[PDB]
């Protein structure tokens, strides 16, 4: 089974270095390219270079003007990337990727990597519950969420139930505020007949200012209808 | 240099419709490769060496093409295939199409819509939050607009949408609307006013402070 495990994503100052990692299993590390591809919203996808492990050769797209440097531990099955003399051009989430096994296609692509270039600090998201909601006066069906509010830089993950609930889940794109910070919702419907006795928790987790939350998401106490 | 022209930019089609999306080259090229992509994950290999389909890749997909212009095939659309569709060639530069945009196009829905008034833990930090959900609604124009008692509320509000849902092919928005928690204590009614071609008149969300 051929992975591609790239590091976490990365706040970095303006004029700072970054070095990113794609380790590698699967295959024999030697006889594969390791390319490394750039992606910014609204942009496409640009092709930044390519390094093969134990050669000493790579190749470099020359927009990068010799700031993307490419290394390759063989003995370890891992593949660096690092990109100098950093701004907001660099902010971008960035690929490695591995060729076919016969073909030259990108086969195999890792998770990704968010960098972001500011010379803003990092701030936590404050966690708070969106308590259940009906959908009608009938009752029947509830929607449910967490906000996730005021952090910076880019991404949060939300899951619920530790990834056991996935079906009517909404996580929204993040809002970036005047303020410069962000903040997005996760939502999910489910059944009315559900709210007594099913929990329902979101998991948070920005990485960047090591902020890592459970938040319970109960109904609330006291409504102004009877009863459905 | 070789430039790939993708074409169109963006479409959009019914379920079990026969779909070409096209890749056209300033000068010939010998092959093409595809690659989906879906928002907030990686892109995937789809087809390769122009007609070769990735392992998993519906039948429905197919790919062709020849010198200046390559093509990729879809015999009958299905709410899965909500993706953005790059073609790549490496004696390109760009190597990389800037990618067509491909959404289904599914009958009128009537957005679901839900109002939360602010958590008590956010109230005491200083601040009121009161989101608004539009849920699972087609087409993507809405209108969301807050009335906080008797008026209209302007640029206090963020709106997000989602991506096209991969299994029904409706989209869903929040708009939350932010107010400092003196703000918040002014006022007593907090509405969302809905508007949707799925509406027959517009919806409205409210409670009390």
């Known amino acids: 089974q051929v992975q591609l495990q790239q590091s976490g994503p990365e706040l970095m100052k303006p004029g700072a270095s970054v070095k990113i990692s794609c380790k590698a299993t699967g295959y024999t590390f030697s006889t594969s390219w390791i390319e490394w591809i750039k992606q910014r919203p609204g942009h496409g996808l640009e092709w930044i270079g390519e390094?093969?492990?134990?050669?000493?050769?790579?190749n470099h797209n020359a927009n990068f003007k010799g700031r993307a440097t490419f290394t390759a531990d063989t003995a370890s099955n891992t593949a660096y990337m690092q990109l100098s003399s950093l701004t907001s051009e660099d902010s971008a989430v960035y690929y490695c990727?591995?060729?076919?096994?016969?073909?030259?296609?990108?086969?195999?692509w890792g998770q990704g990597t968010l960098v972001t270039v500011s010379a803003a600090s990092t701030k936590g998201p404050s966690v708070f519950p969106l308590a259940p909601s009906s959908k009608s006066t009938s009752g029947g069906t509830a929607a449910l969420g967490c906000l996730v509010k005021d952090y910076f830089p880019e991404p949060v993950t939300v899951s619920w139930n530790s990834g056991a609930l996935t079906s009517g889940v909404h996580t929204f794109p993040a809002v970036l505020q005047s303020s410069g910070l962000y903040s997005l919702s996760s939502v999910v419907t489910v059944p009315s007949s559900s709210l007594g006795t099913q929990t329902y928790i979101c998991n948070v987790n920005h990485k960047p200012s090591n902020t890592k939350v459970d938040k319970k998401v109960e109904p609330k106490s006291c409504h102004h209808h009877h009863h459905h | 240099q070789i430039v790939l022209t993708q074409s169109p930019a963006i479409m959009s089609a019914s379920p079990g419709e026969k779909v070409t999306m096209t890749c056209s080259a300033s000068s010939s090229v010998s092959y093409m490769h595809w690659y989906q992509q879906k928002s907030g994950t990686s892109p995937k290999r789809w087809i390769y060496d122009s007609s070769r389909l990735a392992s998993g890749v519906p039948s429905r997909f197919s790919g062709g093409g020849s010198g200046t212009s390559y093509s990729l095939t879809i015999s009958n659309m299905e709410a899965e295939d909500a993706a953005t569709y790059f073609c790549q060639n490496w004696r390109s530069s760009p190597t990389f199409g800037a990618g067509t945009k491909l959404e289904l196009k599914r009958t009128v829905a009537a957005p679901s819509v839900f109002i939360f008034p602010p958590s008590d833990e956010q109230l005491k930090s200083g601040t009121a939050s009161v989101v608004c959900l539009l849920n699972n609604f087609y087409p993507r124009e809405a209108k969301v607009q807050w009335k906080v008692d008797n008026a209209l509320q302007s640029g206090n509000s963020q709106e997000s949408v989602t991506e096209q849902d991969s299994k029904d092919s409706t989209y869903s928005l929040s708009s939350t609307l932010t107010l400092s928690k003196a703000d918040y204590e002014k006022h007593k009614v907090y509405a969302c006013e809905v508007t949707h071609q799925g509406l027959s008149s517009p919806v409205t969300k409210s409670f009390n402070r």
């Open positions: 390094v093969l492990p134990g050669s000493g050769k790579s």
């Open positions: 990727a591995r060729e076919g096994s016969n073909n030259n296609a990108l086969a195999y």
